[model samples]
Target: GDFVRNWQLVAAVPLFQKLGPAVLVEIVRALRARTVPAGAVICRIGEPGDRMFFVVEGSVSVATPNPVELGPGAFFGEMALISGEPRSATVSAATTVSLLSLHSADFQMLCSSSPEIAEIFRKTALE
Candidate 1:
């Protein structure tokens, strides 16, 4: 079903792979699937962001100083959600992309539910 497919996608990300099955299942269920056309901006630099995104298909371009392209299984936009800072980079669809997004509210709920997992996210937010 969709849960199984979502789980497979989420679990492919190294970061999410760190989570236990129960927590991962919760995360997969909470995710909202979306698609964007090429050249569409996902988030802008300096914007106050409220969601984190995981790439399910296609790719995205992060407009950092050294702008990078991210493909399937990659994630972005978490720093703003975790640190309460503006988006550090502008992210746009490099190709027509499929993504899964987790809003700040659900993120907070999941983090608060497990300090250990919250700690993991906090530690990873800097990189």
Candidate 2:
């Protein structure tokens, strides 16, 4: 199954680490793959955020003065995912980014399975 193939990459993300390999594998099956061209705006400041993205290949810049470039395994948007706040930063493709995204709806399914699952992301979002 695709989950078997996708588990390793998704498991490396801190958001999904405590989610467990099997849980993450199921979520990984639901993740949508995206290929963003370099310099494209993935999401910008003030947008209502509902998704968290895992860097599968290439990089993204969280638009800092020097642009904090994050490579494969780094994740963004989780803070907003829990806060239900606007996106924290302007995320743009640094170099043809490849990402796997999970939206709130998909995550909610996991939460329904176990409340502890939801608690972990919120606590980790702050820490």
Candidate 3:
């Protein structure tokens, strides 16, 4: 149920708004949602990255050894999605949290299927 709901939420994001429902549905099909316990490390700084995440509810602390909080609807690991770079910061679950994640291979497949969507990702990464 949460998985289905988060897919709808993904579609609502402006970055994904240009994607038609069918495309969004396809993208969502490749996504899986996770609930992380508070204080758990979600992604570590400088790790080999393989996925990108979108926060749906709750917050995560983004840290570079120092920490910054990123609230709902924000995303991270996008650079991994773009360039397969190492994670830039550590992200910890600030509360019991839910997130939508797209694995690197699936993400690349989605981009290959739609160059327009791929362009959006490139533009956003540059911003």
lDDT of every model, 2 decimals: 0.84, 0.80, 0.79
Question: What lDDT tens digits, residue by residue, belong to model 3 across residues 35-107?
Answer: 8999999998888899888888898989866777877777778677668689998899998888888788886
Q: For each of the candidates, give the backbone clash count.
A: 0, 0, 0
Error of 1 at 119 (Å): 6.3
> Runs in model 1 with CA error above 4 Å?
12-18, 113-127
Stretches of candidate 2 exceeding 4 Å from the true structure = 1-5, 115-126
- Lowest summed lDDT over 10 consecutive residues: which window, candidate 3? 11-20
lDDT of 2 by residue, 87-108 (tens): 8789999999999898887877
TM-score of each: 0.80, 0.80, 0.76
Could you tell me which residue pairs clash in candidate 3?
Answer: none
Scored against the true structure, residue 57 in model 1 reaches a CA lDDT of 91
User: Which of the two, 2 or 3, has more lDDT?
Assistant: 2
In Å, residue 68's CA in model 2 sits off its true spot by 1.0
Q: Which portions of model 3 miss their true places by more than 4 Å? A: 1-8, 11-18, 113-125
Candidate 1, residue 127: lDDT: 42
